[PDB]
Enzyme design. Structure first.
Site, PDB file in Angstrom:
ATOM      1  N   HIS B  41       0.816  -1.216   0.000  1.00  0.00           N
ATOM      2  CA  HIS B  41       0.000   0.000   0.000  1.00  0.00           C
ATOM      3  C   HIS B  41       0.849   1.264   0.000  1.00  0.00           C
ATOM      4  O   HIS B  41       0.350   2.323  -0.375  1.00  0.00           O
ATOM      5  CB  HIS B  41      -0.955   0.016   1.224  1.00  0.00           C
ATOM      6  CG  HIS B  41      -1.375   1.400   1.650  1.00  0.00           C
ATOM      7  ND1 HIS B  41      -2.614   1.931   1.349  1.00  0.00           N
ATOM      8  CD2 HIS B  41      -0.731   2.348   2.381  1.00  0.00           C
ATOM      9  CE1 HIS B  41      -2.701   3.158   1.839  1.00  0.00           C
ATOM     10  NE2 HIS B  41      -1.571   3.436   2.470  1.00  0.00           N
ATOM     11  N   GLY B 143      -0.180   5.424  10.743  1.00  0.00           N
ATOM     12  CA  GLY B 143       1.257   5.378  10.650  1.00  0.00           C
ATOM     13  C   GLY B 143       1.859   4.105  11.185  1.00  0.00           C
ATOM     14  O   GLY B 143       3.068   3.909  11.069  1.00  0.00           O
ATOM     15  N   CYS B 145       1.179   0.983  10.135  1.00  0.00           N
ATOM     16  CA  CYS B 145       1.345  -0.135   9.228  1.00  0.00           C
ATOM     17  C   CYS B 145       2.811  -0.413   8.915  1.00  0.00           C
ATOM     18  O   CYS B 145       3.635   0.446   8.866  1.00  0.00           O
ATOM     19  CB  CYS B 145       0.466  -0.114   8.000  1.00  0.00           C
ATOM     20  SG  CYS B 145       0.873   1.313   7.027  1.00  0.00           S
TER      21      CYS B 145
HETATM   22  C1  LIG Z   1      -0.715   0.947   6.261  1.00  0.00           C
HETATM   23  S1  LIG Z   1      -1.208   0.467   7.927  1.00  0.00           S
HETATM   24  C2  LIG Z   1      -1.120   0.020   5.079  1.00  0.00           C
HETATM   25  O1  LIG Z   1      -0.411  -0.816   4.689  1.00  0.00           O
HETATM   26  C3  LIG Z   1      -2.481   0.010   4.435  1.00  0.00           C
HETATM   27  C4  LIG Z   1      -2.906  -1.131   3.767  1.00  0.00           C
HETATM   28  C5  LIG Z   1      -4.195  -1.122   3.219  1.00  0.00           C
HETATM   29  C6  LIG Z   1      -5.041  -0.014   3.345  1.00  0.00           C
HETATM   30  C7  LIG Z   1      -4.602   1.112   4.041  1.00  0.00           C
HETATM   31  C8  LIG Z   1      -5.516   2.336   4.174  1.00  0.00           C
HETATM   32  O2  LIG Z   1      -6.533   2.302   3.572  1.00  0.00           O
HETATM   33  N1  LIG Z   1      -5.224   3.536   4.967  1.00  0.00           N
HETATM   34  C9  LIG Z   1      -4.025   3.775   5.776  1.00  0.00           C
HETATM   35  C10 LIG Z   1      -3.001   4.577   5.285  1.00  0.00           C
HETATM   36  C11 LIG Z   1      -1.859   4.807   6.046  1.00  0.00           C
HETATM   37  C12 LIG Z   1      -1.732   4.240   7.306  1.00  0.00           C
HETATM   38  C13 LIG Z   1      -2.748   3.433   7.800  1.00  0.00           C
HETATM   39  C14 LIG Z   1      -3.893   3.202   7.041  1.00  0.00           C
HETATM   40  C15 LIG Z   1      -3.325   1.096   4.585  1.00  0.00           C
END
Ligand SMILES: *[C@H](S)C(=O)c1cccc(C(=O)Nc2ccccc2)c1
Ligand SMILES: *[C@H](S)C(=O)c1cccc(C(=O)Nc2ccccc2)c1
Lengths: 302, 302
Positions: B41, B143, B145
């Site tokens: 992502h 933040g 992830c």
């Molecule tokens: C980050 S936790 C991540 O990998 C992710 C995967 C799939 C979807 C999302 C999302 O929609 N929004 C976010 C963006 C940044 C941090 C957390 C979540 C994120």
């Protein structure tokens, strides 16, 4: 979101843990710069523990009686001294992994992380609170003494606890890093026991704010209360008194949620008087009191 | 004695955490040898998240689009590739702090430690269980992830989880280190939601044994039950079925306490049917199911 009993990352403390052996007694020590700190009980025999005179026991020791092992490496002891209930073993080498650190003594109601260790090897990390009666409800087995409690702020480790013993109720007692016990406990054999304890009110209120931040609202009500009336209820339920400083400390969480502190106190009064009616808050069926307002802000700020 | 939600010491994992930035998206990465692992992502824009084709998004990137920071030091990216839902960024330098490690996928009902991190900096450590519905009840903010879950055996870190997202109920989903999601979740915008969950019976029984080892006995009884009758009760209360392998796994704890597994099952049946009548077990007013038999043996063996 979510709310967990979260400890500080333990790596900075892991690189300070060593094994200290005197005679047949092995326990943990904390190696910072060129000093190893450990419980002075390490110089005792089992027979020594009824009215030991530690000054006599220590004068009969020399440096070579202390075996300090840092993982695989033997650390040469070049001096020894007592400081209250801890021993200070000066060693040959300064710990290259020494973090920035402080020795701080904490207050009842404050929390800290514990790095449980055996034979100088870290085993687990968990969060604990210093109870009003100066015990901690830890998780410790034989060989765990010398394990430390700490908080981390920026890159600085504030050590606040060294583990010494287990009381008859299974709760734990120890000292600060200057070797001064928390509470009326001693490092000798007696019938000492934990005194009466109380619930840490300000922390319970902090945790109710955590729950609101995380979407648990069922315990809220339109009511409010005065500080005096709330404290009458607190006293009835063995909760400690809530001060205006506590109310002030809860200020930011009150502002973030829009729930006045004395409104949340009305909710707490209802929960104490009625119980939970089969519901839970943040996954608990009891009122939790080992999160400080700071712990909540740190974990729930998003 | 005592019983706490204990995490593994996190230092070995701390020295692997880095920050990965692509465009305006910053998240955490795991640096092992000369590879940095992170959620794919990271290459998305907010508009990209409805039906993104990650193969297209990635072919439009080059190495210089990935900024990897290990504390103060910039790591030069020299290759990039996708592996399921994770990105593999080959870097210039092998992490000198790489521990012995494995990538293992865990089962529902198994536990692990989570090192919550923000901007590549570790924030806290806590213990989690993989729920039967393949979510975890974590504590994560924006933040987070890229933060990982792991177990440690001897000196080997078995990584089992990378964090990707938060579901609408506030529980969390992610993948294994090969980038394969736990459960029926995807890294795109949908109305995906946690499915129905159940209680992990074998773990609740393990925790009742922990309680007995720690002196809580009030819930014991002279009765016993058959596996079939117990499982009729379990099904009624949304507990998962107890197998003979579960009974076998509880063997050592049964032997240590002298309480047959089917006797402890009779106790659990009573607790499900009657509640706790205002009492607590190991400081909880609910039946806890996030300790495995292994977790209990590790902490309560003394
Ligand atoms: C980050 S936790 C991540 O990998 C992710 C995967 C799939 C979807 C999302 C999302 O929609 N929004 C976010 C963006 C940044 C941090 C957390 C979540 C994120
Ligand atoms: C070790 S936790 C320690 O410092 C200690 C201080 C005071 C009294 C004791 C004790 O009586 N028994 C022991 C001995 C070794 C390990 C734990 C407890 C210990």
């Amino acid at each position: 979101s979510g709310f967990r009993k979260m400890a500080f990352p333990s790596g900075k403390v892991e690189g300070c843990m060593v094994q200290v052996t005197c005679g047949t007694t092995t326990l943990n020590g904390l190696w910072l710069d060129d000093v190893v700190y450990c419980p002075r009980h390490v110089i005792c025999t089992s027979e020594d523990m009824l009215n030991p005179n530690y000054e006599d026991l220590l004068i009969r020791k020399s440096n070579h009686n202390f075996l300090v092992q840092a993982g695989n490496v033997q650390l040469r002891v070049i001096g020894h001294s007592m400081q209250n209930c801890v021993l200070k073993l000066k060693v040959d080498t300064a710990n290259p992994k020494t973090p920035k650190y402080k020795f701080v003594r904490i207050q009842p109601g404050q929390t800290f992380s514990v790095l449980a260790c055996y034979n100088g090897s870290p085993s687990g990390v968990y969060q604990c609170a210093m109870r009003p009666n100066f015990t901690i409800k830890g998780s410790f087995l034989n060989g765990s003494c010398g394990s430390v409690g700490f908080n981390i702020d920026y890159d600085c480790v504030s050590f606040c606890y060294m583990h010494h013993m287990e009381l008859p109720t299974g709760v734990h007692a120890g000292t600060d890093l200057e070797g001064n016990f928390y509470g009326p406990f001693v490092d000798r054999q007696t019938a000492q026991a934990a005194g009466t304890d109380t619930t840490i009110t300000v922390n319970v209120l902090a945790w109710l704010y955590a729950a609101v931040i995380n979407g648990d609202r069922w315990f809220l009500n339109r009511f409010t209360t005065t500080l005096n009336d709330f404290n009458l209820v607190a006293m009835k339920y063995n909760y400690e008194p809530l001060t205006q400083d506590h109310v002030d400390i809860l200020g930011p969480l009150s502002a973030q949620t829009g729930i006045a502190v004395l409104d949340m106190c009305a909710s707490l009064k209802e929960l104490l008087q009625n119980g939970m009616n089969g519901r839970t808050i943040l996954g608990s069926a009891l009122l939790e009191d080992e999160f400080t307002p700071f712990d909540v802000v740190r974990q729930c700020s998003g």
